[PDB]
C-alpha cells in the first residue's frame, strides 16, 4: 500500500497488526510526531502475517525507503528481512518488540518487558504472602514482548516458591475474543478451586478475562485480574474496583523516540541506538501516572 516518495523526509512504519487497540493508539502518537518533525510516514499493516510484513518491507526498500521502523509479527521470523534491508543500505529500527537472531544487531526501542512481567509477579508475591493460584494468559506468542513478559512473571513466581502455583499458562494471541473463551475454559477446568489471580499480558485480553470471571458467576475481588498497557478502558476498570492493576509502558514515547532517531538518521547520518523504557505498575492509588489517564 506504498505510494512514491516525494523527498528524503519519509519513513516507512510497519505494524504487526493494526487491529490491536494498543497499536491503533500508538499510530495516533506516530502521526502527531510525524507532523511535528516534518516527515511523511507511510504506515503498513502486516495483518498478523509475517509473509506480508516481509514483502511490505522488501517493497519499501525497492521504492527507496532509507529508514524503516518495524514492530515485527514474530521477532525471529523477521531477522532475515532486517538483514537484507541493512545489506541494501536501509536502516532498520524495531519498536515495541525486537528483531533477533540475525547477522546484524537491530536497534530496538521498547519497554523493559522482563521488568514489566516481574512487576506483575512481584505484586502477586506481595499481595499473597502465603501463596496463590495463578493463571497466565499470554500475548502475541512470537513477539519478544511476550517471551520477555512471561520470563519476568516466571522469575517473580519462582522467587516466591512452590506456594505460588502457575496452574496453567496459555496464549490468547492478543485477542479479546480468545481471551474470553480461553479464560472460561480454564475457569471451568478448576471450578472447584478457582484461581486467585489471572495475569493477562495485555489489557485487551484482560477485559476478556474480566468478562469470563463475571460470566462464571465469580467475584472480581476473589479472582483478581491484572493486565498490561494501561489503556483507558482498563484504567476505568481499576477506578471501578473491578481490575486491580495494569502496567504502563509509555507507547507514545516508544514510537516518538523511534521516529526522532529515524529523522536524525536521515538528516545527519546519526546512528540508531537501542532504548529500553522502565515500566510502572498502575493501581488505583497512582492512576494518574498512566500516560493515557486523560482519555479515561
Q: Which residues bind ligand INS (CB under 6 A)?
A: 20, 22, 96-97, 139-140, 143, 145-146, 174, 202, 204, 228-229
In terms of DSSP bridges, do strands 246-248 and 10-15 run parallel, antiparallel, or are they unpaired?
A: unpaired
Q: How far is the CB of 206 from ligand INS (least distance, A)?
A: 10
Name the DSSP class of 245.
Answer: B
| In contact, 202 and 262? CB cutoff 8 Å | no
Q: How far is the CB of 22 from ligand INS (least distance, A)?
A: 3
Please state, in angstroms and rounded to a whole number, the distance separating the CA atoms of residues 208 and 177: 7
b vs e for 231-240, b when ≥16 Cβ sit within 10 Å of the residue's Cβ? bbbbbebbee
38: region left, alpha or beta (phi > 0 left; psi from -120 to 50 alpha): left
Q: How far is the CB of 249 from ligand INS (least distance, A)?
A: 6
Longest dimension (CA), the chain: 64
For residues 20 and 183, which CB has a smaller minimum distance to ligand INS in the complex? Answer: 20
| In contact, 74 and 96? CB cutoff 8 Å | no
H or E element: which one contains 118? helix 113-127
Q: How far is the CB of 231 from ligand INS (least distance, A)?
A: 8
Written as nine digits, the cell of 142 is 512470537
For residues 171 and 261, which CB has a smaller minimum distance to ligand INS in the complex? Answer: 171
For residues 25 and 34, which CB has a smaller minimum distance to ligand INS in the complex? Answer: 25
For residues 146 and 257, which CB has a smaller minimum distance to ligand INS in the complex? Answer: 146
Q: How far is the CB of 71 from ligand INS (least distance, A)?
A: 7
For residues 164 and 228, which CB has a smaller minimum distance to ligand INS in the complex? Answer: 228
Amino acid at each position: 500500500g506504498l505510494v512514491p516518495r516525494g523527498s528524503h523526509m519519509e519513513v516507512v512504519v510497519s505494524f504487526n497488526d493494526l487491529s490491536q487497540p494498543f497499536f491503533v493508539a500508538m499510530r495516533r502518537e506516530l502521526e502527531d510526531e510525524a507532523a511535528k518533525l516534518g516527515v511523511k510516514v507511510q504506515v503498513l499493516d502486516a495483518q498478523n502475517n509475517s509473509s506480508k510484513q516481509i514483502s511490505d518491507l522488501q517493497a519499501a526498500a525497492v521504492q527507496g525507503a532509507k529508514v524503516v521502523i518495524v514492530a515485527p509479527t514474530d521477532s525471529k521470523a523477521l531477522a532475515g528481512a532486517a538483514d537484507d534491508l541493512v545489506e541494501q543500505g536501509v536502516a532498520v529500527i524495531s519498536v515495541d518488540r525486537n528483531i533477533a537472531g540475525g547477522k546484524t544487531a537491530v536497534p530496538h526501542v521498547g519497554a523493559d518487558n522482563v521488568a514489566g512481567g516481574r512487576a506483575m509477579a512481584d505484586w502477586v508475591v506481595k499481595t499473597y504472602p502465603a501463596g496463590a493460584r495463578v493463571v497466565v494468559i499470554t500475548n502475541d506468542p512470537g513477539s519478544s514482548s511476550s517471551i520477555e513478559r512471561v520470563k519476568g512473571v516466571h522469575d517473580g513466581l519462582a522467587a516466591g516458591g512452590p506456594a505460588f502455583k502457575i496452574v496453567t499458562e496459555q496464549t490468547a494471541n492478543s485477542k479479546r475474543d480468545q481471551a474470553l473463551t480461553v479464560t472460561q475454559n480454564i475457569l471451568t477446568s478448576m471450578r472447584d478451586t478457582p484461581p486467585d489471580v489471572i495475569l493477562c499480558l495485555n489489557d485487551d485480553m484482560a477485559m476478556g478475562a474480566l468478562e469470563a470471571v463475571r460470566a462464571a458467576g465469580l467475584d472480581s475481588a476473589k479472582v483478581k485480574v491484572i493486565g498490561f498497557d494501561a489503556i483507558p478502558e482498563a484504567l476505568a476498570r481499576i477506578k471501578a474496583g473491578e481490575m486491580v492493576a495494569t502496567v504502563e509502558q509509555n507507547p507514545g514515547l516508544q514510537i516518538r523516540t523511534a521516529l526522532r532517531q529515524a529523522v536524525d538518521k536521515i538528516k545527519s547520518g546519526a546512528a540508531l541506538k537501542s532504548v529500553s523504557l522502565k515500566p510502572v505498575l498502575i493501581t488505583s492509588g497512582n492512576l494518574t501516572e498512566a500516560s493515557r489517564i486523560g482519555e479515561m
